[PDB]
Amino acid sequence: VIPEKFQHILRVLNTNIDGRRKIAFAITAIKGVGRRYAHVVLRKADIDLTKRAGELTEDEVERVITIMQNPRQYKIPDWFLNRQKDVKDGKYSQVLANGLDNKLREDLERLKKIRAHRGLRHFWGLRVRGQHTKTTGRR
Amino acid sequence: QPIKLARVTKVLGRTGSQGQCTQVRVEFMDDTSRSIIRNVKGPVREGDVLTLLESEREARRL
Amino acid sequence: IRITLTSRNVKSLEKVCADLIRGAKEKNLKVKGPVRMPTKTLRITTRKTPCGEGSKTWDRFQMRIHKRLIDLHSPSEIVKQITSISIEPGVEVEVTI
Amino acid sequence: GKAKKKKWSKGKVRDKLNNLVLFDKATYDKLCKEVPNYKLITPAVVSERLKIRGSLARAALQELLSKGLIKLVSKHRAQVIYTRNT
Amino acid sequence: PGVTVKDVNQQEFVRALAAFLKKSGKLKVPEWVDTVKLAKHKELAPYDENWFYTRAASTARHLYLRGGAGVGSMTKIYGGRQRNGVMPSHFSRGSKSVARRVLQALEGLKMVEKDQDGGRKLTPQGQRDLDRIAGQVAAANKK
Amino acid sequence: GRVRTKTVKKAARVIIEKYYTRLGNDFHTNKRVCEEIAIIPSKKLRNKIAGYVTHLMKRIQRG
Amino acid sequence: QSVQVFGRKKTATAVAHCKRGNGLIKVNGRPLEMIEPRTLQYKLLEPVLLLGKERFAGVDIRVRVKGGGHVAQIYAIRQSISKALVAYYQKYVDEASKKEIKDILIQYDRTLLVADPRRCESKKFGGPGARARYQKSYR
Amino acid sequence: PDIKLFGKWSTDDVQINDISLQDYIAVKEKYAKYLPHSAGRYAAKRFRKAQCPIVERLTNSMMMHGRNNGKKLMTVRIVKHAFEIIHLLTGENPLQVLVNAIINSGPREDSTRIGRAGTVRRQAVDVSPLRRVNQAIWLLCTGAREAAFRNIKTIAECLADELINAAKGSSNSYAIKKKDELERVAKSNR
RNA sequence: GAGGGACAAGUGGCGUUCAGCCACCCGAGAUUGAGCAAUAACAGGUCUGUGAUGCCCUUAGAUGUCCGGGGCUGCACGCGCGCUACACUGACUGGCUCAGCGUGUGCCUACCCUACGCCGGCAGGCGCGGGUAACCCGUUGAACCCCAUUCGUGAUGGGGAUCGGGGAUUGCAAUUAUUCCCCAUGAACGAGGAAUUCCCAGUAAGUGCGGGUCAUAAGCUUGCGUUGAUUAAGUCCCUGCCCU
Ligand SMILES: [Mg+2]
Ligand SMILES: [Mg+2]
Ligand SMILES: [Mg+2]
Ligand SMILES: [Mg+2]
Ligand SMILES: [Mg+2]
Ligand SMILES: [Mg+2]
Ligand SMILES: [Mg+2]
Ligand SMILES: [Mg+2]
Ligand SMILES: [Mg+2]
Ligand SMILES: [Mg+2]
Ligand SMILES: [Mg+2]
Ligand SMILES: [Mg+2]
């Protein structure tokens, strides 16, 4: 009946801290993994939802990290990933927690060279989709 | 320190800065037919048994 | 074969209905009833004002479109004989064979 | 920017209180010992009094229901109603 | 005796029928629904693993109720309250892919006859199947 | 509620002044008598006038 | 033998066809024990759990409702049964028992024979509801 | 032919131990109904509200605060769970302790303004018994709501605990807390 | 469609002969909600609705009119009407079950309502049919609500603002506004001080739908439906009004 397994908090990708309430909602704590993607990776890994994060095998953790680093070998088509076709490489992949901030830095680094007003309003204290900025953006 | 009860015989009128209390000359159940006038706020009819915490007062009418 | 009497107002509707039933009783035709239709209403709400001063005071304009349908199986000569009716101008007549 | 609010009401119940995810050895042993002593087996009392979460409380109550020690009166949306005979 | 599906409560009927359709093996589930499919316009996936058989049982119950519904009609039958966030909620509709999937699967398993003017309607084989399943569910209820 | 208009009371006084023997002490008969002897288009006004006519009949029957 | 009694809830109408038989109440092909809320499985049975069992076994009534709300349909079924028994006791059974059972129904409840004269009022052109107004702006 | 019963209940021999609240609680046989969700049309006459049953009044005062403003089926279910919890707590019938809570759940007098257009002294005056029933039901449902706010306990469980701690003079319920808050101020301004 | 039914009529009491008031019953109701709404004024708004208009201004490089961009959306700020939350009466998932106003085409001049089947996960595309309308959308299988699972008091799965990549639709053109959909990023917010707005029975509030602009287009407004409170039915104390 699973009395107690010696597992409290895991460590994934050197920055993220896994929780203790579930397994999908602890993979949700990884940046770049949110509401639906964690449950999709769990359903590909075929793990029962009643089991916690402290009741799961480290080999299965490595299998989940394998699905993270290469999802396209089995399943999960190109629409569901975070990073779509516009890469400057044209590669269909899922971003990491350390990788997402680096991709945002590359986005802003090329938008500063483009000098588009989207990058200009992000560099200044303005909003891109903030069409009205009377009440929006105070303090 | 007695706590007595009393049923309403008649209703005189309504009184207050808001017009909320009702001056009620109630009656005495536990004794003979004697008369005190009480200020009762809230709805009241003729025959409502009222809880009295002090049977020593007397309100005045105008 | 059906005949639709669509009127602007209820008084001319009932007058042309009574006149048509009075003209249809004496002939040898199985006359169906003046089938009542639901009254249509075009509700229009208006600001009442060109400039926005005062409370939001709105109009409510309506019409009462009234309609009746009857069924009269008859030859076309008898239908064209019944068609000639001294009628109120607020009543429109449609025929369908 | 600045943080300003018009009311000041701090000091809640207990300071981000911890709560057990899975039942321990001695904790579940104490549960099995004094679970006949409670007359009204409700998951809120089992969770708040005995340092249990709601999910582990419902899991333990369904486990004792499958064991057949506490009789269910009427189960519903969120008011699980259990009672022990005698 | 005579058992009607309205005589028995539904939350026993669909809960048994989602397993009797597993026992009969009447499901088509090609590739994308094997992978993952979300709800109407939502953020999560259904929980109980037999949700395909649950949708098929609800489709069978609704085609027993109303004969002549279609893909869009059954999509409006399912329906949805689309919570948008700051913008208030409205009534959105479900997906048409499962709505044609379940009808195509039951047509391949010989339970849906097409209408010449509308869509799905009942078959005598599916009538016998649902009537015997409702009878054994009523027998399990009374026993 | 019965604080009726002067034209209503004046019409009912004209009715009770001209035609008394045609009126009785029943509302459903006095209304039909008043609508046989007078012209009132509004049915609420018919009921109002006939009620005050019955009230005047109950006053005349006493004193 | 065949008397159909109608509804008259606020936006709910229950046609109740009566018939002599062996004990049946049909609500849109669905029997008496099935009520669309689970909470109201004492209010709809008030003609059943108060008036006896031989009346239920003697009178068969099918009920078809074209209501608009659930509570409106429940009270429409209740009023349609409680008036269809009165109509069947007018058309078949003697008045010496009809008046007794009518006095029992009246002294139990008012809404068994008398309908509710309550319809929703029109929304006003000044405020958001039938009585309310919007918020003012003073200084 | 059977007795009028809520669920599997009896609704009999529920005795009001005192006067000044008699003929206002509908617990008797002449006003016994099967569910609180009844045809509530008691807002026309000034004195037809007292014929409403106190369980229906408790449901109507329980449904408040916008997010639950309505849902009589839900609040009748909540009061059903509360009566079931009170019954399973060593018997001590929920209808009887509900009547006892209406009797002993708050004010016996209140202080308010007097006229004279002068100094407001807030003289302690009498209170209507209907107003005592109203304020008792209001304090019980408010205490149950703020006891079941932000916890694991439910509305029904805290309402059952509130009715038990109000029927028993333990001075640990919010109805008795506001009873203290009203009667100490009433004795001070007496 | 016509007619009926309700008028304080019948009883008791209080009131002056009166005028009238309170409770009962028969009744569906002992009266619902709107429209119109007097004399005389505001030195209230509209010349930016009118080929409705007086005076002045411009009339040939035009203050007339077309075409191509920007703008009214621009933000160190304060204010008003509103929507969503601050969770467990709840959030998620699955099942069940109910409507009413009202709208819809080849127009006194350019345009919809969409049913059925197939494909795509999605917004959507394709073939075909009906409706100038109680015919078809449509028996508007609506949301809350009715049951079962998950969550467990943790800024948490409540909240979805902000931001990045992509996919479809109207439009000739959406980037410094369309809109919608998929993933991801997940702040403040712990029921709000001084002050203040609305409301007495199908009422406020919760919740959804139809019309107006519409092409894409509602968080506004007008109407309609579902569930449906607590408590007054009194007063002139704050404010304002009517008559001496
Ligand atoms: Mg303001
Ligand atoms: Mg609110
Ligand atoms: Mg000219
Ligand atoms: Mg502007
Ligand atoms: Mg400006
Ligand atoms: Mg405004
Ligand atoms: Mg959320
Ligand atoms: Mg969060
Ligand atoms: Mg809401
Ligand atoms: Mg449109
Ligand atoms: Mg629109
Ligand atoms: Mg606008």
Between CA A75 and CA H136 the distance in angstroms is 63
Between CA H14 and CA H29 the distance in angstroms is 10
Instruction: Centre a 10 Å sphere on the Cβ of residue A108 and count the other Cβ atoms it contains.
Output: 14
* 3-state SS class at C41: coil
Cα(H67) to centroid of ligand 9, in Å?
6
Burial degree of H140 (CB within 10 A; 0-12, 13-18, 19+): buried
A-chain CB neighbours of D16 within 8 Å are: none
D and H adjacent (3 or more CB pairs under 8 angstroms): yes
Between CA F7 and CA F11 the distance in angstroms is 6
Between CA H34 and CA H11 the distance in angstroms is 10
DSSP-assigned beta bridge partners for residue E81? E91
Alpha-helical (H) ranges within F1-63 are: 6-18, 27-37, 43-62
Helix (H) or strand (E) holding G63: strand G59-65
Q: How does DSSP classify residue H90?
A: T
The pair of three-digit structure tokens given for residue H41, joined into one six-digit string = 């049309």
CB C37 within 7 Å, strand I: yes
**Of residues D2, D21, D23, nearest to A20 (C-beta):** D21
Q: Which ligand is nearest to the CA of E89?
A: 9
- The spacing between the Cα labelled CA in F52 and the C1' in I190, in angstroms, equals 68
Covered bases, chain I (protein CB within 7 Å):
1-2, 4-10, 17-24, 26-35, 44-46, 49, 73-84, 86-103, 114-125, 134, 138-155, 157, 159-167, 175-177, 180-186, 188-193, 196-209, 211, 218-219, 221-237
Backbone angles phi, psi at E38, to 5 degrees: -80, 180
The per-residue DSSP string of C46-77 comes to --S-SS--SS-----B---BEEEEEE----HH
Residue in A96, A99, A119 with CA at minimum distance from that of residue A107: A119
A-chain residue closest to E37, CA distance: A40
Q: CA dist H6 to E49, G42, G46, H60, Å?
A: 40, 8, 11, 18
Q: CA dist E106 to C8, D56, H17, Å?
A: 54, 41, 68
The full length of chain G comes to: 139
Cα(A126) to centroid of ligand 5, in Å?
19
Residue in B34, B3, H128 with CA at minimum distance from that of residue B25: B34
Q: Under 8 Å CB-to-CB from F38, ≥6 apart: which residues?
A: F11, F15
Q: CA dist D23 to A47, A94, D17, G30, Å?
A: 21, 37, 17, 47
Per the CB < 8 Å rule, is H34 touching G37? Answer: no
The pair of three-digit structure tokens given for residue G10, joined into one six-digit string = 């606020």
Q: Under 8 Å CB-to-CB from E8, ≥6 apart: which residues?
A: E134, E137, E138, E141
Q: Which residue has the tokens 């009932």?
A: C14
Give the max Cα distance, chain H. 63
Between CA G41 and CA H8 the distance in angstroms is 13
Between CA B34 and CA B27 the distance in angstroms is 6
Residue in E46, E59, E62, E52 with CA at minimum distance from that of residue E18: E52
CB A110 within 7 Å, strand I: no
The full length of chain D comes to: 86
Number of domains in chain G: 1
Exposure class string for A43-61: b at 16+ Cβ within 10 A, else e: bbbebeeeebbbbbeeeeb
Q: Which domain holds residue G74?
A: 1-139
Between CA A30 and CA A97 the distance in angstroms is 6
Helix (H) or strand (E) holding H152: none
Write out the residues surrounding ion ligand 2, Cβ under 5 A: H 66
Q: Under 8 Å CB-to-CB from D43, ≥6 apart: which residues?
A: D54, D57, D58, D61, D80, H152
- Resolution value, angstrom units: 3.5
Cα(F61) to centroid of ligand 9, in Å?
65
DSSP-assigned beta bridge partners for residue G61? G18, G25
Q: CA dist G2 to G20, G42, G81, G84, G92, Å?
A: 9, 28, 14, 10, 10
The per-residue DSSP string of E10-32 comes to HHHHHHHHHHHHHHHT-----SH
- The spacing between the Cα labelled CA in B19 and the C1' in I146, in angstroms, equals 46
CB H115 within 7 Å, strand I: no
The answer to whether the beta carbons of residues C5 and C82 sit under 8 Å apart is no
Q: Give the count of alpha carbons within 13 A of H29, CB side only.
A: 5
The full length of chain F comes to: 63
Give D73 to chain H, closest Cα distance, Å: 9
Alpha-helical (H) ranges within H42-154 are: 54-62, 72-88, 94-103, 129-147
Between CA H168 and CA H147 the distance in angstroms is 18
* 3-state SS class at A73: coil
Q: Give the count of alpha carbons within 13 A of D34, CB side only.
A: 9
H and A adjacent (3 or more CB pairs under 8 angstroms): no
Between CA H132 and CA H127 the distance in angstroms is 7
